[PDB]
Short mmCIF file of C-alpha atoms and ligand atoms in Angstrom, two decimals:
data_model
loop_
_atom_site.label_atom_id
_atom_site.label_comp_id
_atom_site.label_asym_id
_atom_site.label_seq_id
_atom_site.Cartn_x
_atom_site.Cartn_y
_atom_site.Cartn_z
CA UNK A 1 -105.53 29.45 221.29
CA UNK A 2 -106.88 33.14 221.18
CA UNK A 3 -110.03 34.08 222.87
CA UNK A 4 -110.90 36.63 220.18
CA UNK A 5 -110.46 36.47 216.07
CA UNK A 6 -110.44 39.47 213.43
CA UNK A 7 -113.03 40.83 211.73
CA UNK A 8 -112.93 42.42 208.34
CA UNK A 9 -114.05 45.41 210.29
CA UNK A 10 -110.82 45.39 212.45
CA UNK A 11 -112.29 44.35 215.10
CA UNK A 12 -111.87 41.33 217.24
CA UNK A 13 -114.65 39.10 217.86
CA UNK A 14 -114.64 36.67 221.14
CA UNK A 15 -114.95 33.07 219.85
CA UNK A 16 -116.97 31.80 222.54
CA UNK A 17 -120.56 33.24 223.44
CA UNK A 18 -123.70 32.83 225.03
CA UNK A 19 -126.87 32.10 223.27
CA UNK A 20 -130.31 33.30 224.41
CA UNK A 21 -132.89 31.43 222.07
CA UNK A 22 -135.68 29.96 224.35
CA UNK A 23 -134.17 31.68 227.36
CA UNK A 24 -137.21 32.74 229.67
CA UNK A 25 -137.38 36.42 230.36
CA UNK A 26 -137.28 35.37 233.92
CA UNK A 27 -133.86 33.19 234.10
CA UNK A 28 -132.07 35.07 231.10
CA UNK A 29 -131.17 37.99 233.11
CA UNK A 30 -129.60 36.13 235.92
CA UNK A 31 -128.51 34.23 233.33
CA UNK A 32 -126.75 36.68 231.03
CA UNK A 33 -125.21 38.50 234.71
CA UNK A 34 -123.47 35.02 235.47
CA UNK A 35 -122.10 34.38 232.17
CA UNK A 36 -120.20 38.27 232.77
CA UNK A 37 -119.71 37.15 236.15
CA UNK A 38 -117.44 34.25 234.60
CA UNK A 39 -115.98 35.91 232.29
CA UNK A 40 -118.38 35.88 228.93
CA UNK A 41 -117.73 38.57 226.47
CA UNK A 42 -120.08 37.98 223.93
CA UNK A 43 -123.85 37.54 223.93
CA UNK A 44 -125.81 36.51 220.75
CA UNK A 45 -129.33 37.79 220.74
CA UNK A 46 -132.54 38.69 218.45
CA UNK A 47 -135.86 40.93 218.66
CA UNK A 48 -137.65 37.55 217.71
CA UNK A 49 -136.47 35.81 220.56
CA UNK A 50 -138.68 38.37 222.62
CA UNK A 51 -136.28 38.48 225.63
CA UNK A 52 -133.74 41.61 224.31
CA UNK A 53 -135.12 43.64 227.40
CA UNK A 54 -134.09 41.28 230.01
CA UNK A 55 -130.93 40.32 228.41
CA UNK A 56 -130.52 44.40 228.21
CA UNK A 57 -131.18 44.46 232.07
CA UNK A 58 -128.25 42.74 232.86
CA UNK A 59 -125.84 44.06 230.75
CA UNK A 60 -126.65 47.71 231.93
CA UNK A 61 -126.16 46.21 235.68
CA UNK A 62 -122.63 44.65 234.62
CA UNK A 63 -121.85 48.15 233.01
CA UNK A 64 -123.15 50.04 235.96
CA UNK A 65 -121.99 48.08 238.51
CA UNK A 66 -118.27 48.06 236.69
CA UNK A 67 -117.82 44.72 236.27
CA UNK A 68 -116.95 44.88 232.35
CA UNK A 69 -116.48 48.18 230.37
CA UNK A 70 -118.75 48.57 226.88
CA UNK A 71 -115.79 48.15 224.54
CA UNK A 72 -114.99 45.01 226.06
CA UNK A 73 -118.18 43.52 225.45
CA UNK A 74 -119.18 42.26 222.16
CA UNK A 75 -123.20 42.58 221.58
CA UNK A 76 -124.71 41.09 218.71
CA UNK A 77 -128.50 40.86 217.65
CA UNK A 78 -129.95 39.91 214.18
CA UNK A 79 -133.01 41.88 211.69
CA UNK A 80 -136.62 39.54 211.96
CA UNK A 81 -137.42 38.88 208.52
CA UNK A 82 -140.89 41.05 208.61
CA UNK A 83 -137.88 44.08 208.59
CA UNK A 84 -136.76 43.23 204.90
CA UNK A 85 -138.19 46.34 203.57
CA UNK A 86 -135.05 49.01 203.40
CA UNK A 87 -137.63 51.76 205.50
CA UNK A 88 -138.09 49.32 208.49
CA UNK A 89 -134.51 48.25 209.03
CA UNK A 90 -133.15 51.26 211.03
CA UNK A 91 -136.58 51.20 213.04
CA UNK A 92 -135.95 47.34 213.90
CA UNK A 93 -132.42 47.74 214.79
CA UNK A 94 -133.32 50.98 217.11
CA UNK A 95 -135.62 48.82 218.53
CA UNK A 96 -132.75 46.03 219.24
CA UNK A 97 -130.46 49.21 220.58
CA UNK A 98 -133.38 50.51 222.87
CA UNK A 99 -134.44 47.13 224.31
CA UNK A 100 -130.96 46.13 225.01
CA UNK A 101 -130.30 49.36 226.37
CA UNK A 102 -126.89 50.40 224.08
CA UNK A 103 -126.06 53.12 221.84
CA UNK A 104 -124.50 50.86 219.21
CA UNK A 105 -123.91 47.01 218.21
CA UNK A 106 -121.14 44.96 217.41
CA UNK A 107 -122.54 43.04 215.10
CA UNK A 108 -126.05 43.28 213.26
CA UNK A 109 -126.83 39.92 211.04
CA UNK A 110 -129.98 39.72 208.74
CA UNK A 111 -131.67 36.55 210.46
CA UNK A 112 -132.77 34.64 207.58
CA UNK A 113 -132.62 35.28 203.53
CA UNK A 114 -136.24 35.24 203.57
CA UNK A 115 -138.10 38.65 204.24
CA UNK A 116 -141.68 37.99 205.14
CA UNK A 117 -144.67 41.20 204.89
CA UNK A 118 -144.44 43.72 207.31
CA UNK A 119 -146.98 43.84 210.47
CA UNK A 120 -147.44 42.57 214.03
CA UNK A 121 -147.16 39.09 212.91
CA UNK A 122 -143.41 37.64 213.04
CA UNK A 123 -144.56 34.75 210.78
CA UNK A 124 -147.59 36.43 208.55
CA UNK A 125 -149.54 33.46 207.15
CA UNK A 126 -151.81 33.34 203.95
CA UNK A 127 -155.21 31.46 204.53
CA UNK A 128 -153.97 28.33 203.89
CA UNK A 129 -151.08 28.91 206.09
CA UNK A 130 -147.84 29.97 204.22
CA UNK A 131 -146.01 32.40 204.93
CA UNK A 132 -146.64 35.91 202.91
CA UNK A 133 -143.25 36.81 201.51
CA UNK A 134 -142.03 40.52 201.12
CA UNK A 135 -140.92 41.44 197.77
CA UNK A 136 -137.72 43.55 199.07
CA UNK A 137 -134.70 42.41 197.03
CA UNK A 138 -131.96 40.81 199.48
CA UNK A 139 -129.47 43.39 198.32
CA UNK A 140 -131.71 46.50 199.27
CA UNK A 141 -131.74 44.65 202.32
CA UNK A 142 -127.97 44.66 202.52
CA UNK A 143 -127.57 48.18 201.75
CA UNK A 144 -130.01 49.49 204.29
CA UNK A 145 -127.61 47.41 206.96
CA UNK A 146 -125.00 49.25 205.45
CA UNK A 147 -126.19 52.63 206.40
CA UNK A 148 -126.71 51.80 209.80
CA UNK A 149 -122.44 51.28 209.43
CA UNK A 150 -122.31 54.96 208.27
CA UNK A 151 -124.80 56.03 211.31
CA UNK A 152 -123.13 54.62 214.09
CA UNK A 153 -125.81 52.18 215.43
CA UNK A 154 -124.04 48.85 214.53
CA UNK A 155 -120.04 48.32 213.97
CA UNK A 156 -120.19 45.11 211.31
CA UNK A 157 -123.17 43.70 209.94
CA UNK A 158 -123.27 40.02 208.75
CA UNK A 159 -126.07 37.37 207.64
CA UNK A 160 -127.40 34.25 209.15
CA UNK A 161 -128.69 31.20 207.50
CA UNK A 162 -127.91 32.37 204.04
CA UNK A 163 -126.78 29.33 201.98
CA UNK A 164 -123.37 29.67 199.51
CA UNK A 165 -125.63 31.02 195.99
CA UNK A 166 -127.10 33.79 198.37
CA UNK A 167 -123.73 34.41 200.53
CA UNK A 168 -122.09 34.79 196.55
CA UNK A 169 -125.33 37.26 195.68
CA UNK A 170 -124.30 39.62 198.41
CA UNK A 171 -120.41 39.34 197.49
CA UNK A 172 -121.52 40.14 193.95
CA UNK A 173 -123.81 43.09 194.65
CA UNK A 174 -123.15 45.83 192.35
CA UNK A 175 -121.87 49.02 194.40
CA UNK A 176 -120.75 46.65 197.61
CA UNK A 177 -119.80 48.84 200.09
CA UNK A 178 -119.37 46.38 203.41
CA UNK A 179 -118.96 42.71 203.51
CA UNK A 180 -120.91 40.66 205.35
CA UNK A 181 -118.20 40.18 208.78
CA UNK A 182 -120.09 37.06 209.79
CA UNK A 183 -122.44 34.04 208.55
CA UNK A 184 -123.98 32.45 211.74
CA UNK A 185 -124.83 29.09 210.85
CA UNK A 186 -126.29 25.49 212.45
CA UNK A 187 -122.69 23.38 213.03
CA UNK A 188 -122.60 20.57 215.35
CA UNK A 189 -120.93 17.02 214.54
CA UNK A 190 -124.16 16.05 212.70
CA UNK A 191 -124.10 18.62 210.42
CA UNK A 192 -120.70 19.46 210.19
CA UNK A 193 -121.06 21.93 206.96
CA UNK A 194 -117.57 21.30 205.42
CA UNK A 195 -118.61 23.06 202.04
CA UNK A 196 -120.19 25.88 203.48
CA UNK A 197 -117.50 26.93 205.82
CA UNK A 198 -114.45 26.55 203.63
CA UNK A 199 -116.27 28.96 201.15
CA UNK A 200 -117.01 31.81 203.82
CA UNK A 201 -113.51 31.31 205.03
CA UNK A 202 -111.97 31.41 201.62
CA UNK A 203 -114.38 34.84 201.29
CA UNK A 204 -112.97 36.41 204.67
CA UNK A 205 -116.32 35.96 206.36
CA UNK A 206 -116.27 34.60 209.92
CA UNK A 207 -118.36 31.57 210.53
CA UNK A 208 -120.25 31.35 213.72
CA UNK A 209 -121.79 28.05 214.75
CA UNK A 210 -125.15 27.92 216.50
CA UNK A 211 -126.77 25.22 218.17
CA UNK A 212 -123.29 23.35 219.10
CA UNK A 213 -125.14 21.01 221.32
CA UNK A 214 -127.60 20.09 219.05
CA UNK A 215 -130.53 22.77 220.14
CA UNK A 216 -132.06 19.79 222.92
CA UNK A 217 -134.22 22.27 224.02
CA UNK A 218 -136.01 23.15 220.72
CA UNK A 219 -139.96 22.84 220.38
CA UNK A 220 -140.34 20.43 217.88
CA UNK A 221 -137.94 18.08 218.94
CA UNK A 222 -139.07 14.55 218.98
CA UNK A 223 -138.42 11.90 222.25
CA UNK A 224 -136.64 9.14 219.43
CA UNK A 225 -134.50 12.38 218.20
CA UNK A 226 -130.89 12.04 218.52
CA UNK A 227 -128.93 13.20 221.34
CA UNK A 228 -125.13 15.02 220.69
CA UNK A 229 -125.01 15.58 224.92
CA UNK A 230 -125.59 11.63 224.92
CA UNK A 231 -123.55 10.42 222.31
CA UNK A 232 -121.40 7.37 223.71
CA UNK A 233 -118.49 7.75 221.14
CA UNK A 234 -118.62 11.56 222.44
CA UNK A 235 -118.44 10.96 225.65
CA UNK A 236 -115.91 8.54 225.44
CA UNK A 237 -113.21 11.50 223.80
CA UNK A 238 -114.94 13.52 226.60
CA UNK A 239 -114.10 10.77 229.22
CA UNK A 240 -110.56 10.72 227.98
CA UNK A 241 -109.96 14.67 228.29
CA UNK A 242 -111.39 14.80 231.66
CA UNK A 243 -114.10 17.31 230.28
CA UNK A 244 -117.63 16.91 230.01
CA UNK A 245 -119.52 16.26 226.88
CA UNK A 246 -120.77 19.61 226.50
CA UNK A 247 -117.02 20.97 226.78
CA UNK A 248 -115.97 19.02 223.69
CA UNK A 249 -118.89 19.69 221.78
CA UNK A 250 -118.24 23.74 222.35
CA UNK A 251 -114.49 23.22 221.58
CA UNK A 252 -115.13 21.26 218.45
CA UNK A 253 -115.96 24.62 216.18
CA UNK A 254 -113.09 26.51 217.96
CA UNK A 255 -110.06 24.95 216.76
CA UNK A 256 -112.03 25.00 213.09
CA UNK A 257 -111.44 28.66 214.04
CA UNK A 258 -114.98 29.10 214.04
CA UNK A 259 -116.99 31.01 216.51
CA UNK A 260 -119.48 29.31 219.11
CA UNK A 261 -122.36 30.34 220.82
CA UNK A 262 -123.80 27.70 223.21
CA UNK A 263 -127.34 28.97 225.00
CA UNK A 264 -127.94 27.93 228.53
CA UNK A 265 -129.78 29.65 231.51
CA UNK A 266 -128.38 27.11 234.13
CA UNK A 267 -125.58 28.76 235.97
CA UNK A 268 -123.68 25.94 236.44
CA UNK A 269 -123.06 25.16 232.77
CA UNK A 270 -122.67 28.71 231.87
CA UNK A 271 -119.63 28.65 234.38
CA UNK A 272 -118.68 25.08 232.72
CA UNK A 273 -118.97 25.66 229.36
CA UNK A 274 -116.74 28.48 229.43
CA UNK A 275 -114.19 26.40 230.62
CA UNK A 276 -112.73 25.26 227.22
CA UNK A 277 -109.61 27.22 226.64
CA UNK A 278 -107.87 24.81 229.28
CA UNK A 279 -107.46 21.33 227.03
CA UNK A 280 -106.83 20.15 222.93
CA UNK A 281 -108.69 17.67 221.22
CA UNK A 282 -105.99 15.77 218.62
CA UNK A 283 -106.33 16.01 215.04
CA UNK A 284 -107.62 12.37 215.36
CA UNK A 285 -110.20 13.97 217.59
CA UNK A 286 -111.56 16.43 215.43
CA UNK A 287 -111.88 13.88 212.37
CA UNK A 288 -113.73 11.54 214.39
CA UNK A 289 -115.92 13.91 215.38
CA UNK A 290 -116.02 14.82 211.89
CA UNK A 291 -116.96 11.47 210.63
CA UNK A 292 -120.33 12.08 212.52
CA UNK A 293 -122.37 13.76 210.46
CA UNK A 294 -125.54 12.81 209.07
CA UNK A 295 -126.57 16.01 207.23
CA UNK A 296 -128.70 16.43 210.50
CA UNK A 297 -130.33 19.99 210.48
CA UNK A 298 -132.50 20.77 213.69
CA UNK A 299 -133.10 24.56 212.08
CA UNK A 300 -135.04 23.95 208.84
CA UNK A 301 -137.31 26.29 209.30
CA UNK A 302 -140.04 23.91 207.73
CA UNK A 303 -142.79 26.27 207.71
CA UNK A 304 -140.94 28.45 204.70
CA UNK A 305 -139.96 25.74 202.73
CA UNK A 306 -142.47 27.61 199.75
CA UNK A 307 -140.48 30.61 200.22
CA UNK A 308 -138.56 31.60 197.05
CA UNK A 309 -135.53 32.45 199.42
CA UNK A 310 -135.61 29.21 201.32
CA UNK A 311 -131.93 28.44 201.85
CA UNK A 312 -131.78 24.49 202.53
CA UNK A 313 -132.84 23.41 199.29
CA UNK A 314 -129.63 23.87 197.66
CA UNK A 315 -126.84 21.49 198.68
CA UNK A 316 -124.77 23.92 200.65
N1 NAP B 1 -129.22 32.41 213.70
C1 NAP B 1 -130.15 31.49 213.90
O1 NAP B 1 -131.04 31.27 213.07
C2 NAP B 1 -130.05 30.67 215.15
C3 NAP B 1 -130.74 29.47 215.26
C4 NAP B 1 -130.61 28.72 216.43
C5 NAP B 1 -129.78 29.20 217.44
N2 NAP B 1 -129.12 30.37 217.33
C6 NAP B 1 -128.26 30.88 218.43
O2 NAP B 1 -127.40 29.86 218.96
C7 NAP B 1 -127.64 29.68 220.36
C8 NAP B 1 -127.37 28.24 220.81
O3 NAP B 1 -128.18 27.33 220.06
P1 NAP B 1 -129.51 26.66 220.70
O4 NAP B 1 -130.12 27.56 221.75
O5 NAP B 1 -130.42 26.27 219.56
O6 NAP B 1 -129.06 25.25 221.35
P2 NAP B 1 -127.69 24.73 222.01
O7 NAP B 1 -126.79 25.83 222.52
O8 NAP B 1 -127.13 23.67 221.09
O9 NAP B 1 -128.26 23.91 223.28
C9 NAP B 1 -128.96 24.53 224.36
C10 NAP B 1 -129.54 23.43 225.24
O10 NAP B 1 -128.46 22.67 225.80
C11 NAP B 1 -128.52 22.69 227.22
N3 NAP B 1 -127.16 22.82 227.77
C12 NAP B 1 -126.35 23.88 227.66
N4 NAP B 1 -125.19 23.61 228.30
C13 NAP B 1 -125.27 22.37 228.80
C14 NAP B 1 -124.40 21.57 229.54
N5 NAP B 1 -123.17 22.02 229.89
N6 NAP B 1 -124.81 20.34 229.90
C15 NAP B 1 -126.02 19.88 229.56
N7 NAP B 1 -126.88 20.62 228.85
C16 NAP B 1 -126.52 21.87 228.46
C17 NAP B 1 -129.38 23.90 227.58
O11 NAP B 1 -130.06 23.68 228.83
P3 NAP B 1 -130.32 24.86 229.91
O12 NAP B 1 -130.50 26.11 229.10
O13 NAP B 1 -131.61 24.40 230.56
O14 NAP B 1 -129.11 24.86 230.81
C18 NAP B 1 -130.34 23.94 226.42
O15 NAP B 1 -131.40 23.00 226.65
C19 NAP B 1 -129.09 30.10 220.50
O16 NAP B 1 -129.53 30.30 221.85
C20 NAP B 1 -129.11 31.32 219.61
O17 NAP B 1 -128.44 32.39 220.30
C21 NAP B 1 -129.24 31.10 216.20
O1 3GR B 2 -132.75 31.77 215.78
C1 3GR B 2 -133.81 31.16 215.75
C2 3GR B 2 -134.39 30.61 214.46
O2 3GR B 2 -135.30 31.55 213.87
C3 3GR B 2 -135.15 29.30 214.77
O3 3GR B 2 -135.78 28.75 213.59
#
């Protein structure tokens, strides 16, 4: 299959990248230079994750050193919701540009529906400890990522986490000038979001699925939590391919013609888990994996579940 899909931009969009959630500031440059090194394309970042300088460090070194030219890599990074307000967006995304040390992005996504106050806080609590929303409109929001279009700081701007009512809000908003290129959401094969993906696809809107290994490495997981990596009816399709469990798990999304962006800071399985484009898993394959899911969301975001823009209440 391709390496890259379209955009409604025009531009082409590699379908496998690396993720830098939880990546230490110590290991994600070495980290980021090896996935280059073996022939990454595409890096999926965020100011929250507070690592955008490091990751930035070894891109410029790639650059510099000539290993990849600039229009052949594919940068994204996403707005923190404490950004909502349309006179902070341009500031946040400069911010992005400046850390990561590039004059533009490929792709810009508003994190989450929710916008939270402004302020040094990334999650601003009330006494009782909710979090304080912002009362910016989500399509204000949209149109201040659509001037950074008409500036020249990002190339396509998308959303992340937004559920199908809110992805239909932006669709619908009056005046429209870009639509969202991208909706990065959690897909694995216990949450395989059937309903949610067919509608983005039948908008034109390029799904990207995060956490493809089931995000093992996430804070609040819990010892009796499920395992996707140690699955045994996983690793048996694994066993049969001759690939590794992580290799089917990353190729599962792509022939959904999805976009995947599996996060690791061991060099070893960034070299491995780039090494999909090599095998097919049957139609058979891709239903039983399919037949997995549990509705199993590791992303809730639990803390926001008050929030009047919370997206997981609604079915899909
Ligand atoms: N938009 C959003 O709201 C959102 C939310 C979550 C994630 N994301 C994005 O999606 C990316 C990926 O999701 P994620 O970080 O939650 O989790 P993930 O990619 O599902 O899993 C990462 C974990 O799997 C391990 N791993 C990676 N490759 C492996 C392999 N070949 N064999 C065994 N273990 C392997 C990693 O270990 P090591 O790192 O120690 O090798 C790490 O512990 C994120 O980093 C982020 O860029 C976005
Ligand atoms: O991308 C990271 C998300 O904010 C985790 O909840």
């Amino acid at each position: 299959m391709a390496s890259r899909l379209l955009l409604n931009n025009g531009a082409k969009m590699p379908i496998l990248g690396l993720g830098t959630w939880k990546s230490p500031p110590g290991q994600v440059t070495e980290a980021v230079k090896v996935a280059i090194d073996v022939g990454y394309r595409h890096i999926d970042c965020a100011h929250v994750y507070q690592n955008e300088n490091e990751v930035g460090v070894a891109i410029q070194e790639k650059l510099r050193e000539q290993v990849v030219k600039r229009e052949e890599l594919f940068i994204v990074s996403k707005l923190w919701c404490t950004y909502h307000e349309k006179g902070l967006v341009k500031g946040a995304c400069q911010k992005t540009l400046s850390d990561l040390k590039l004059d533009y992005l490929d792709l810009y996504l508003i994190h989450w529906p929710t916008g939270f106050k402004p302020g040094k806080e990334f999650f601003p609590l009330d006494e009782s400890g909710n979090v304080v929303p912002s009362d910016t409109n989500i399509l204000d929001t949209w149109a201040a990522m659509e001037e950074l279009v008409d500036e020249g700081l990002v190339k396509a701007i998308g959303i992340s986490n937004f559920n199908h009512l809110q992805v239909e809000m932006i669709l619908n908003k009056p005046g429209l000038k870009y639509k969202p290129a991208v909706n990065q959401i959690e897909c694995h094969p216990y949450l395989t979001q059937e309903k949610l993906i067919q509608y983005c696809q039948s908008k034109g809107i390029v799904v990207t699925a995060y956490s493809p290994l089931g995000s093992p490495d996430r804070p609040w997981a819990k010892p009796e939590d499920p395992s996707l990596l140690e699955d045994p009816r996983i690793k048996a399709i694994a066993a049969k391919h001759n690939k590794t469990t992580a290799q089917v798990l990353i190729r599962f999304p792509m022939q959904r013609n999805l976009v995947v962006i599996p996060k690791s800071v061991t060099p070893e399985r960034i070299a491995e888990n780039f090494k999909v484009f090599d095998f097919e898993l049957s139609s058979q394959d891709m239903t039983t994996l399919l037949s997995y899911n549990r509705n199993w969301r590791v992303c809730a975001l639990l803390s926001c579940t008050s929030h009047k823009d919370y997206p997981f209440h609604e079915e899909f």
